[PDB]
Design a protein around this ligand. Sequence first.
Ligand SMILES: NC(=O)c1ccc[n+]([C@@H]2O[C@H](COP(=O)([O-])OP(=O)(O)OC[C@H]3O[C@@H](n4cnc5c(N)ncnc54)[C@H](O)[C@@H]3O)[C@@H](O)[C@H]2O)c1
Ligand SMILES: CC(=O)N[C@H]1[C@@H](OP(=O)(O)OP(=O)(O)OC[C@H]2O[C@@H](n3ccc(=O)[nH]c3=O)[C@H](O)[C@@H]2O)O[C@H](CO)[C@@H](O)[C@@H]1O
Ligand SMILES: CC(=O)N[C@H]1[C@@H](OP(=O)(O)OP(=O)(O)OC[C@H]2O[C@@H](n3ccc(=O)[nH]c3=O)[C@H](O)[C@@H]2O)O[C@H](CO)[C@@H](O)[C@@H]1O
Lengths: 343, 335
Amino acid sequence: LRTILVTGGAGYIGSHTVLQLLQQGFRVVVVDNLDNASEAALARVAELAGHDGANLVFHKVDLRDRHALVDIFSSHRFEAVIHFAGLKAVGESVHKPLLYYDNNLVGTITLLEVMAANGCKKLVFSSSATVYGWPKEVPCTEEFPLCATNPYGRTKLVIEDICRDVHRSDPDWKIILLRYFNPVGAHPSGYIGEDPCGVPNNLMPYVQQVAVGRLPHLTVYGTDYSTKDGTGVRDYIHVVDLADGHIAALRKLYEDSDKIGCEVYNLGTGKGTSVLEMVAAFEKASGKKIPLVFAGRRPGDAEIVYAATAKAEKELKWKAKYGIEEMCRDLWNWASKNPYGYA
Amino acid sequence: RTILVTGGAGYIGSHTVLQLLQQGFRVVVVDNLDNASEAALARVAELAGHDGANLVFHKVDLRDRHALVDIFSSHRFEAVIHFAGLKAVGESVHKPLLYYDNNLVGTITLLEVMAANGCKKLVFSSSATVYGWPKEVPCTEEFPLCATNPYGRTKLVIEDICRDVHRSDPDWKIILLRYFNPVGAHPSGYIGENNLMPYVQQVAVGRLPHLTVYGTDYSTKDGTGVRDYIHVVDLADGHIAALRKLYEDSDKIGCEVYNLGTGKGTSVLEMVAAFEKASGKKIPLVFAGRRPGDAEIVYAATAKAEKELKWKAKYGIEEMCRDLWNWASKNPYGY
Ligand SMILES: NC(=O)c1ccc[n+]([C@@H]2O[C@H](COP(=O)([O-])OP(=O)(O)OC[C@H]3O[C@@H](n4cnc5c(N)ncnc54)[C@H](O)[C@@H]3O)[C@@H](O)[C@H]2O)c1
Ligand SMILES: CC(=O)N[C@H]1[C@@H](OP(=O)(O)OP(=O)(O)OC[C@H]2O[C@@H](n3ccc(=O)[nH]c3=O)[C@H](O)[C@@H]2O)O[C@H](CO)[C@@H](O)[C@@H]1O
Ligand SMILES: CC(=O)N[C@H]1[C@@H](OP(=O)(O)OP(=O)(O)OC[C@H]2O[C@@H](n3ccc(=O)[nH]c3=O)[C@H](O)[C@@H]2O)O[C@H](CO)[C@@H](O)[C@@H]1O
């Protein structure tokens, strides 16, 4: 038996990773306070897991709840921990920074302490390409200068530094930091997917709601950038590909862990795609038309960001297999099948 | 006028509490006593003279939200001076989570309790360590910031937290004070304290045989490291000025950062010579290579602090060594 602890597994990226984990034969324990997710996402993952659905156990616990967390760790043998949990809305983080510093930092510090006290010192952390700030060049390698422009991005960069300091003090720690780029899409079944609250802030969940008629038009944030068509360019990666990156991270920690301490890997496709190109791909995949409103640049937006995949391909032995066309297909499938989410 | 002082039983905190007690403030100190004795605040109450009755102490950890909420509901604080936290750099590298927990989680809880109680006026004890190895000197508040150890990272992260908090809530008035190198003690010799001058003192009395000079080939005038050493009583006065600035000229304050230094740079050998004159003892030396992570030369740009904060250091190197020797001679085994 191989058991994995997954914080925030009820959420968007976590649920898709939990499903892949169950299909690989892992036992999965999820810890999630359901603050930005519902039980339904986990129940449907259990259903998609077929026979392996019973290998998923859900604990409705906050990572800051130290006693509830010790109970879980002292009553389990965890091979590793995948740490998805945290708040992630950039706008909300600027307006309520203490909420973000509290939930993300105190939750992570508590988790790391409970892990070290219960002999589990293998960790995979959800970092983000936001730590590259506004990069001076592309593609972004893992050695690019790091910075943060908002409280949310600050919590990611600080947790990274905490993980590096922790390994520096204790060589028994094996930590892989995964800098996600822009995940889009859903499981190709259309049964699970991203279910954002309120008005979505990311591009593709917004275009999604325009396509099903819930919102009237997409607002394009700035057209005067130095890109092909003036819109921002991003590295869009299929969420299923992001999930498989975590499987490859566990395989790295399980088979070739003597040569790692606290490592960082990009999880991207290496291809840059503009806003209009994504809208064009979603119109082709869905047959719907996305009305456009043109506005100025969004404060804090980068111009062009995509990943240098060489390091992940070499050390993790991992490369994304889904392209833009499949991402929009699977997003539309989840969208048309579940236009109002899990509710 | 009541002021909450976290970490007020410590080195810099006790001296600030004494200066506050002499200025006529009621002072409530919160300190878990994990790195300080209660005898320090007992002696401070003595030196406060007729004002000793204004000091109130609570042995409370900042992470204890329930206890911390009760103290804030018991008084109406004008502002909070935040000294509390761990500061041993070597203890930050070997035990980083202990530092990230105590400093960050303690500070987060305090800022939240402050906001809920309505006391959004903060003076935070930062450090010139955030200037890393400066490319030029003197170091202004605009210099690029970076941390080189877990302790320094907690200092820089707390500064950014205060930056973000004020940005989200204009009712907040925050002053960040970057200390430099504290030296000395209250001139009475009654209170005081990993650093050069405490190491020099142990060599003077004989607890240690010699002082290792870490690096002799620096691009300085005598080849040894240069720092901005500031009297701890001057540091205490800098916080009185920070409260004066918050209480008077406050409408143009958001999250202001002020250096607290003398503006003068003194080498290692110059401090050894200064302490030998004030103590009469001799300091045998052993010259060694550069210590890893050590800045070459660092000292403060004091122009911003002299104008807007209306503060300037009063004490020089000679008096620092005199008060340090005075306190350590009369109390060789501490409190
Ligand atoms: N979503 C993205 O586009 C993206 C890209 C880069 C990085 N990331 C990071 O990847 C991770 C996963 O993102 P996501 O899209 O799945 O987000 P999500 O909000 O869908 O999932 C995060 C989950 O964590 C849970 N959670 C939050 N605080 C918790 C706490 N204190 N204790 C327990 N559970 C808690 C939430 O309830 C939620 O279910 C996050 O850490 C995010 O910051 C996100
Ligand atoms: C500043 C900011 O919020 N950055 C976050 C976001 O931005 P990031 O810009 O990377 O991603 P978004 O999905 O928010 O935006 C993608 C692109 O589409 C454009 N766009 C987006 C939404 C919309 O309604 N209209 C529109 O035109 C943007 O200008 C951008 O060029 O990416 C990640 C989310 O997964 C986070 O790690 C980043 O912190
Ligand atoms: C690694 C470390 O501890 N950093 C702390 C230290 O740095 P900082 O170097 O500024 O102060 P130190 O007391 O450690 O020594 C200052 C100077 O004396 C020299 N020296 C010191 C001791 C010795 O035994 N021999 C010798 O030659 C140093 O090289 C340096 O040039 O003082 C500050 C006190 O406020 C703290 O903020 C810093 O976090």
